[PDB]
Structure formats: structure tokens, C-alpha cells
Amino acid sequence: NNITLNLNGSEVEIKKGDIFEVPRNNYKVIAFNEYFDTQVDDVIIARETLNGQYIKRYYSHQDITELDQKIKDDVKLKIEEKNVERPFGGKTTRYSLGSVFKDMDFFLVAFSKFDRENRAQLKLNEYASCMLNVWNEINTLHASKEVFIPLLGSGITRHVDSDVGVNELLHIMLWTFQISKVKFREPAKVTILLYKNDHKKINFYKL
Amino acid sequence: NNITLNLNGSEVEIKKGDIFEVPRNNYKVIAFNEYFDTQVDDVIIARETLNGQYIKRYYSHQDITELDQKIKDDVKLKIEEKNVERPFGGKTTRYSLGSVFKDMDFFLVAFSKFDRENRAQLKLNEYASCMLNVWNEINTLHASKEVFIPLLGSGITRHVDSDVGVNELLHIMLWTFQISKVKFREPAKVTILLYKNDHKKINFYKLKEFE
Ligand SMILES: Nc1ncnc2c1ncn2[C@@H]1O[C@H](COP(=O)(O)OP(=O)(O)OC[C@H]2O[C@@H](n3cnc(C[C@H](N)C(=O)O)c3)[C@H](O)[C@@H]2O)[C@@H](O)[C@H]1O
Ligand SMILES: Nc1ncnc2c1ncn2[C@@H]1O[C@H](COP(=O)(O)OP(=O)(O)OC[C@H]2O[C@@H](n3cnc(C[C@H](N)C(=O)O)c3)[C@H](O)[C@@H]2O)[C@@H](O)[C@H]1O
Numbered sequence: 001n002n003i004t005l006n007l008n009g010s011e012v013e014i015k016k017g018d019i020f021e022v023p024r025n026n027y028k029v030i031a032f033n034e035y036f037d038t039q040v041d042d043v044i045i046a047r048e049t050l051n052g053q054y055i056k057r058y059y060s061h062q063d064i065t066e067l068d069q070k071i072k073d074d075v076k077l078k079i080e081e082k083n084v085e086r087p088f089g090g091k092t093t094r095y096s097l098g099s100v101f102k103d104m105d106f107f108l109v110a111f112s113k114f115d116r117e118n119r120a121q122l123k124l125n126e127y128a129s130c131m132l133n134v135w136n137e138i139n140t141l142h143a144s145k146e147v148f149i150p151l152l153g154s155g156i157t158r159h160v161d162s163d164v165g166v167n168e169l170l171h172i173m174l175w176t177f178q179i180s181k182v183k184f185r186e187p188a189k190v191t192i193l194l195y196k197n198d199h200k201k202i203n204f205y206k207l
Numbered sequence: 208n209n210i211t212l213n214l215n216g217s218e219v220e221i222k223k224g225d226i227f228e229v230p231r232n233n234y235k236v237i238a239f240n241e242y243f244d245t246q247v248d249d250v251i252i253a254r255e256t257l258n259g260q261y262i263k264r265y266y267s268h269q270d271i272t273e274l275d276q277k278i279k280d281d282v283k284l285k286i287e288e289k290n291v292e293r294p295f296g297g298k299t300t301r302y303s304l305g306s307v308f309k310d311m312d313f314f315l316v317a318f319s320k321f322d323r324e325n326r327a328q329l330k331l332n333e334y335a336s337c338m339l340n341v342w343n344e345i346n347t348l349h350a351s352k353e354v355f356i357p358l359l360g361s362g363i364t365r366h367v368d369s370d371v372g373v374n375e376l377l378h379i380m381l382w383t384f385q386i387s388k389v390k391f392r393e394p395a396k397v398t399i400l401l402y403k404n405d406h407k408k409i410n411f412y413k414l415k416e417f418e
Contacts, residue, residue: 124390125343128383129336136332162390172389175382176335182379183331183369 001204007178010187014170014207017193019050020057022148024105029138029149030054031111031157033120034080035091036071036101038064044090044118049156054106071101077110087116097126098133102141109134112157121158128172135180135187142188149173150193166201174207208406213418214385217394221377221414224400226257227264229355231312236345236356237261238318238364240327241287242298243278243308245271251297251325256363261313278308284317294323304333305340309348316341319364328365335379342387342394349395356380357400373408381417 002015019028030050037044038059040052047056059067068091071077078096086092099110111130112120122130131152138147153159153169164172173192181187194202209222229235237257244251245266247259254263266274275298278284285303293299306317318337319327329337338359345354360366360376371379380399388394401409 124386125339128339128386129332132332132335164389168389172386175386179331179335179379179382182371182375 001199003204003207005174005207007174007181010181012174012177012190012192014192014194014202014204016195016199017148017191018195019148019150019193020053025145027105027107027138027142027145027147029107029109029134029147029152031109031150031152031155032101033112033114034094034097034110035084035086035114036068036095036108036110037090037114038068039090043088044086044114046156050150054108067103070103074101077101085116088118090114090118096133097122097130098137100134100137100141107138107141107147109137109152111152119158120156121160122153123160124162124164127153127159127164127169128176131173131176132180135177136183138190139180139184139187146189146191148191148193150195151198154198166198167203167206170202170207208409208411210411210414212381212414214381214388217388218396219381219384220398221409221411222398222400223402223406224355224398225402226355226357226400227260229400232352234312234314234345234349234352234354236314236316236341236354236359238357238359238362239308239315240319240321241301241304241317242291242293242321243284243302243315243317244297244321245275246297250295251293251321253363257357261315274310277310281308284308292323293325295325297321297325303340304329304337305344307341307344307348314345314348314354316344316359318359326365327363328367329360330367331369331371334360334366334371334376335383338380338383339387342384343390345397346387346391346394353396353398355398355400357402358405361405373405374410374413377409377414378417381414385417 004013077099081094084092095110101108154166211220247262252259284306288301302317308315
């Protein structure tokens, strides 16, 4: 099923699709972690995540070195902490949740937190506040292009202080989008893509 | 014009009322600043705010000393920074926005930020993130009692990066309430109070659309 929600003049469309099949004339969101980690060894970053699929599909190992340098050099990324201890490897600079690094037509999001076991996790309020910063970045950077975003949080992300369901993750995305709209009266045209069986789990009647 | 909203099995009532006329057996929310400042001299804290009215109504200058001590003794208040320079006076410990200090039947909220001019202000995302933490504390502390709350942000607070109106502040309060409900599936029974003729500036039709 495909739907288009008119949110007081701003249309958000929810439909089935593949984030990697969107034409190049559009922006695509991919959730990274609070370190923008790029090591896809199934230890730090897992190849099953979009974070992992994106790096393996578009980046050779020597290209990853340049990507790490461009992120490090992006002065707009707000730093929360430096010289953090990663016991199994990984980058040592932690960024604010919801920070967006622009990688050509892709918006790479500092989405989830990592502990010393490299377990991606968010408290519910951290998830809500992260999405707020994501819409803030998206509404700033869209430049009249359309933005495609997956159902952020509905993957391996551990929601450690709630029993939130995928339908509720979608509702939090729409609520924080409506909050962000108040600041950006002309927001981006956003499309939320559902993947495979996740399209059936969403109740479009309530949506 | 008084209405009750049913938000997925949770009732949030919006009515006209006076926060200082609520029965003692209920919890009442009052917005302080990020420092929990208590000096009402119209320089730091202005007597026109609920922050100032609450202090003048219930606290002598001698009692304020004990209140200042009880706040800094509260280990639950998360500290963002210590020893900030206040050029015109005030407290130097800064707390996370939305921190709630419980003062008997009152919830005192670290609501707004202060600059070196002592200007209460919030960016819109700071306001939304503040309300998120407020509902978190309220849903944690309510203990089956009813919680009464004013329309936070609709007073002297400066919204510095948007043209947010009164109705939109109320909509953000409800949206952040709905988010916090996902974590607290038995949320507090909440009543939002509108003062004097502020109910006349509220579009109650748009409020019912939250159902
Ligand atoms: N082609 C496609 N098009 C459109 N939608 C698609 C799609 N394919 C799949 N979807 C669906 O889209 C939803 C989102 O997908 P996804 O982004 O993967 O999930 P997420 O929860 O939003 O984010 C994951 C978080 O974990 C971190 N992380 C990275 N590696 C680790 C391992 C670590 N050691 C640990 O154990 O934690 C942790 C990573 O940095 C990130 O922050 C999902 O429903 C999926 O089915
Ligand atoms: N009896 C009643 N019952 C029910 N509702 C009532 C009521 N009375 C009034 N209402 C209505 O309730 C709404 C909220 O009232 P109120 O709390 O006053 O406004 P607020 O924006 O939510 O919070 C103010 C912020 O500024 C800070 N601040 C403190 N002093 C300064 C001066 C500083 N030098 C500067 O210049 O900034 C700044 C203070 O710490 C706080 O964070 C409003 O619509 C009002 O009409």
C-alpha cells in the first residue's frame, strides 16, 4: 500500500521501495552511528545494516580512507567528545546525535549510540531528539530536492528503555516532522520508504 | 471553552484556570530557568513571570536560602556546566533543560536558557527537547496524582529562531506528550491551564484533530 499524508500543506509520502533505487536527482538518508564508523567487519559495523550495505556498495577500502578524512574535516559536525576508548577499534570522535554529513546525494546520519560492546542503542527520548535534529538538517539542506528516508530505528537499533513498535517509530518520525515544520514553514518533500514485509506491518488506516 | 482530549486512551484536559488555585493534593508545574534562579529583582527573575509569582507568594527571603540549598543538594538534577559567569548576579550551576526539582506539591522546571543579558530564550528544537524531558519527569514522578501545567513558553520566553505562535506551542506540548506516552504507557493524568482570556486565542478545533 502507498499513501501520501497532507500535513497542513506539507505532503509526506509513505510507500514501499528501495533506498538504493532512487534516481540520482534526489537525496537519500542512511543511518550511521555517533562516530560515523566505516569499518564493516561485522564487529563494529554489520554488513546487514544500511550503514554496512551503503559502504560496501559504493566504497572500496582505499576510498573509505578519503571518506574518513572528509567527515573529520567537516567543521559543521558538532563534536560531543574526543579521544574516546574503543576497545575493539573504531573512530574516537563522538558527534551529536542527528548530525548529518553530506556525501554527494546521500545524507549520512549520526543516528545511534555505541557502547563498549559496539551495541547500537537509543533511549526513546534520544531517538525523538535525534529525529528532531535529522529533520532540522534535512529542512536546511534539501534545496528543493526530494528527500528519501528509511524507517529509522526499525533495524538492529536497540531501544533500551521502551517496547516501541515499528508503527510507533513511524509515528515519532511524523510527530517530530510536524514539530520541525514550525521552524521551517517550507519543509522538504520527504518520502519514507518501507522495505519488504515492513510494508504490511504498518497500519495505513491509522496513518 | 474547555475540552478534554483522548490521546490513544490517555486523557489530557485543556481548560481555563489559575495554577495557584489548584487543590494541594495535585501537582503543579512552574517554569524556572536553567539555573533555578530565585532572585526576583526584575533583573534576573522578573516578578511578572510565574517563576517570580511563585517565589514571592510562597517564599520569604529567608526561606529562599533553604530552597537554594535543597536544589543544589538534589543529586538527580543533571548538571550541564558549573561556574558559569553571571555578570549581573545569579546562580552559576547550569542544569539540563527540562530538569524537574520537586518542591512539595510543585514541580519546578529548568525551562529556559539565560544569556549574559539574562534574556530567557529557547530555540525551537530546545523547546521541543525541553518538553520531552518534562513529560519524562512528570510521567516518572506523578504517583497517580493529577498534574497541572501552564502553557509553557507563552510568556516572556523568547523563541529566537521561529515565529511560533501560542497554538503551535500547545501543539508541540501535545506532540511531545504523545512521544513520551510510548515509553510511559500509563502516563500521568494531565491538565493544561490557560490564563484569563488566553483561551480565546486557542483554536480548539485544531486541538481535537489530535484524536
Ligand atoms: N534497501 C533498503 N531500502 C529501504 N529500506 C531498507 C532497505 N534495506 C533495509 N531497509 C529497512 O530500513 C530500515 C532501516 O535499516 P537500518 O538502517 O539497517 O536500521 P536502523 O535501526 O535504522 O539503523 C541501524 C543502526 O545500527 C548501527 N549499526 C551498524 N552496524 C551495527 C552492528 C553493531 N556491532 C551492533 O551490533 O549494533 C550497528 C548503524 O550505524 C545504524 O545507526 C530497516 O527496517 C530495514 O529493514
Ligand atoms: N496564575 C496562572 N495560572 C495559569 N496560567 C498562568 C497564570 N499566570 C500566567 N499564566 C500564563 O501561563 C503561561 C506561562 O507563564 P510564564 O511561566 O510566566 O511564561 P513562560 O514563557 O512559560 O516561562 C517564563 C520563562 O522566563 C523565565 N524568566 C523569569 N524571569 C525572567 C526575566 C528575565 N530577566 C528576562 O528578561 O528574560 C525570565 C522563567 O524562568 C521561565 O523559564 C503564560 O501564557 C501566562 O500568561
